[PDB]
Amino acid sequence: KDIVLIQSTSSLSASLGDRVTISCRASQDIRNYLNWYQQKPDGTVKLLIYYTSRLLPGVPSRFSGSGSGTDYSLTISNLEQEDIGTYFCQQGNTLPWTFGGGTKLEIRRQLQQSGPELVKPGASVKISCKDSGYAFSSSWMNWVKQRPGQGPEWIGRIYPGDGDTNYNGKFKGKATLTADKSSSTAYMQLSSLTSVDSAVYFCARSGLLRYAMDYWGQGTSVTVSS
């Protein structure tokens, strides 16, 4: 079994200025390889904390991370408006990378992806991700699935340099990852689509830390019609 990540609280509201603390739990000691992403109401994703407690450039100091072994947490010392969205943890100890179920936080009382697609059941789609950055061929391009309400799912990755890939077993016969160095574009084809495939798919890069995706595409929504 892949390491399961749990975020016991899936919905929490609070007032501005409030101290907010979100818990993440792993089914096995993930040796401090734990990250936290923020997804704003518009669906965009961002890596906030990596390796349990390291803030990424530009994150506000009101964010911190704690924990070890199997128990981790994210804390916002005083909630701000821009802090609204959903928070997902993710383990980077063993492939496939797995994410928690997300915690939607509310207030009480370079990666350029292709457009949305609508398809009939059983049809296939090939979507793209153009990276304007200089590390396209020297980084890993990861892909993530997000069904409305569920936690993201790491589908697999590809190293544009030599075309090597690493898939999540669940999507092996489902996804085919390819890239193009001359155009700095990573492609993902999803075959024989079912209603279970309707979702938003993200491309996200990693390089310095293969388990933490620090740059994300805006996401492409694929809908498998009735």
Does residue 222 lie within any of the structural domains? no
- Map residue 213 onto helix, strand or coil: coil
Tell me which of 56, 90, 110 is where a domain ends: 110
Q: Buried b vs exposed e over 165-177: b needs ≥16 C-beta within 10 Å?
A: bbbbeebeebbbb
- Of 132, 168, 154, 138, the closest CA to residue 202 belongs to 154
Tell me which of 75, 110, 145 is where a domain ends: 110
Does residue 221 lie within any of the structural domains? no
- What is the rounded (10 degree) CA torsion for 112, 118, 124, 127? 0
Number of domains in the chain: 2
Does residue 13 lie within any of the structural domains? yes
Query: Same domain for 2 and 103?
Result: yes
Query: Same domain for 101 and 15?
Result: yes
Query: Same domain for 47 and 20?
Result: yes
DSSP, residue by residue, 168-194 = -GGGTTTEEEEEETTTTEEEEEE-S--
Query: Same domain for 28 and 59?
Result: yes
What is the rounded distance in angstroms from the CA atom of residue 205 to the CA atom of residue 44?
A: 14
Does residue 224 lie within any of the structural domains? no
CA pseudo-torsion sign 173, 2, 121, 219:
negative
Query: Same domain for 98 and 139?
Result: no
Does residue 58 lie within any of the structural domains? yes
Query: Same domain for 146 and 207?
Result: yes
Query: Same domain for 178 and 123?
Result: yes
Query: Same domain for 120 and 208?
Result: yes
Tell me which of 90, 110, 130 is where a domain ends: 110
Instruction: For residue 154, give its domain range.
Output: 111-216
Does residue 85 lie within any of the structural domains? yes
Query: Same domain for 89 and 170?
Result: no
- Map residue 32 onto helix, strand or coil: coil
Query: Same domain for 1 and 102?
Result: yes
Give residue 141's region: left, alpha or beta (phi > 0; psi -120 to 50). Answer: beta
- Experiment type: X-ray
* 3-state SS track over 123-154: CCEEEEEECCCCCHHHCEEEEEEECCCCCCEE
CATH code, domain with 9: 2.60.40.10
- Of 120, 112, 133, 118, the closest CA to residue 187 belongs to 112
